[PDB]
Amino acid sequence: QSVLTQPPSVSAAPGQTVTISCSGSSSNIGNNYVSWYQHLPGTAPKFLIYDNNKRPSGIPDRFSGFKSGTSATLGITGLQTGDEADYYCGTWDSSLSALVFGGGTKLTVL
Amino acid sequence: QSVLTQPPSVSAAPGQTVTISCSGSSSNIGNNYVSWYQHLPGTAPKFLIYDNNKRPSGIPDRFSGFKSGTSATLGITGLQTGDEADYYCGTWDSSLSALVFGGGTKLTVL
Ligand SMILES: [Zn+2]
Ligand SMILES: [Zn+2]
Ligand SMILES: [Zn+2]
Numbered sequence: 520q521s522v523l524t525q526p527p528s529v530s531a532a533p534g535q536t537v538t539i540s541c542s543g544s545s546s547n548i549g550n551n552y553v554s555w556y557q558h559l560p561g562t563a564p565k566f567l568i569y570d571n572n573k574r575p576s577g578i579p580d581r582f583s584g585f586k587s588g589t590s591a592t593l594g595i596t597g598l599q600t601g602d603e604a605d606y607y608c609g610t611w612d613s614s615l616s617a618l619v620f621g622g623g624t625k626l627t628v629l
Numbered sequence: 630q631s632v633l634t635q636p637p638s639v640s641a642a643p644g645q646t647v648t649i650s651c652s653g654s655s656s657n658i659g660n661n662y663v664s665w666y667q668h669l670p671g672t673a674p675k676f677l678i679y680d681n682n683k684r685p686s687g688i689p690d691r692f693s694g695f696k697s698g699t700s701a702t703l704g705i706t707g708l709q710t711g712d713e714a715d716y717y718c719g720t721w722d723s724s725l726s727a728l729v730f731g732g733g734t735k736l737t738v739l
Contacts, residue, residue, distance in 0.1 A: 521727065554674060563685035564664055564676045575673035577687070607728075617631070618717075618730065 521622030522615075523547065523608055530627040531598055539593045539624045541608035547619055551611040553591040555584060559604035567606075568593060600628050631732035632725075633657065633718055640737040645708050649734045651718035652700045657729055661721040663701040665694060669714035677716075678703060710738045 524542040531537045539555075541548065553571050558564035566575050568584035571591065583594045591608055609620040633653045641647045653659065663681050668674035676685050678694035681701065691706040701718055719730040 556674075556676070558679075563679050563683070564666075565685065566666070566674050566676065569673050573673070575675065617732070620728065620730075622727065 522612065522619035523610070523621040525606075525608060525621035525624045527622070528625045528627065530629050532629045533598055533600060535598050537595045537598055537602075537626060539595075539606050539608075539626070541591045541593075541621050543589050543591075543610065543619075544612075544614075545589055546614035547610045547612040548586065548591050548608075549589045550613055553584065553586050553608055553610045555591075555593045555606065555608050557602075557604040557606050595626075598628060602626060603628050632722060632729035633720070633731035635716075635718060635731035635734045637732070638735040638737065640739055641708050642739050643708050643710060647705045647708055647736065649703045649705075649716050649718075649736070650700060651702065651731050653720065653722075653729075654699055656724040657699075657720045657722040658696065658701055659699040660723060663694065663696050663718055663720045665701075665703045665716060665718050667712075667714040667716050672714075705736075708738055712736060713738050 555568040556566045567582045571586040572584045581597045585592050605623045607621050607623050612619045633651050635651050665678040666676045677692045681696040682694045693704045695702050716734045717730050722729040
């Protein structure tokens with residue numbers, strides 16, 4: 520199992536909003552900056568959010584992040600078929616002195 | 630301790646070449662695609678290499694990857710002051726059925 524907990528899968532239709540939860544502890548998500556990235560087999564992995572809610576240059580505002588307490592969420596509005604991919608949250612764990620990641624959420628566009 | 634083993638730090642002067650090694654086992658690097666990303670605290674993390682040796686769109690060719698047997702290496706030619714960051718390797722680990730990552734390499738440009 521993963522140190523950070525994500526749902527294995529999420530699905531919605533084009534144009535709809537999806538959110539992906541990521542649950543942790545005070546040692547990791549509670550006290551530390553959360554990042555998110557996506558990877559679909561065959562294409563490059565790409566970071567979408569960092570420092571909880573900031574977007575790399577080139578990521579559109581359809582993507583956003585919110586962290587409160589020991590949970591972080593990635594929101595995707597205007598869902599596009601090109602958003603199909605595995606999505607992962609990650610953060611530093613102060614107790615383990617190590618980066619930890621969620622186990623991944625497969626996003627299916629219906 | 631991290632599943633994949635990287636040197637803790639490397640250092641070189643601007644213009645020089647640096648290589649950063651990443652070592653695993655047949656369960657991970659030996660039979661799975663390796664990716665690399667960089668994170669300089671305060672800036673967006675970014676993927677540099679995936680599927681052993683492919684560059685994401687937007688990454689210039691002075692970054693390269695090589696993987697042979699149970700080890701993988703990242704190369705950076707024409708080192709720039711802007712290349713200061715922490716560099717991580719990652720792969721699928723077939724015995725964990727999970728992604729695993731190296732502990733990170735801090736790169737200082739002297
Ligand atoms: Zn992946
Ligand atoms: Zn980082
Ligand atoms: Zn560091």
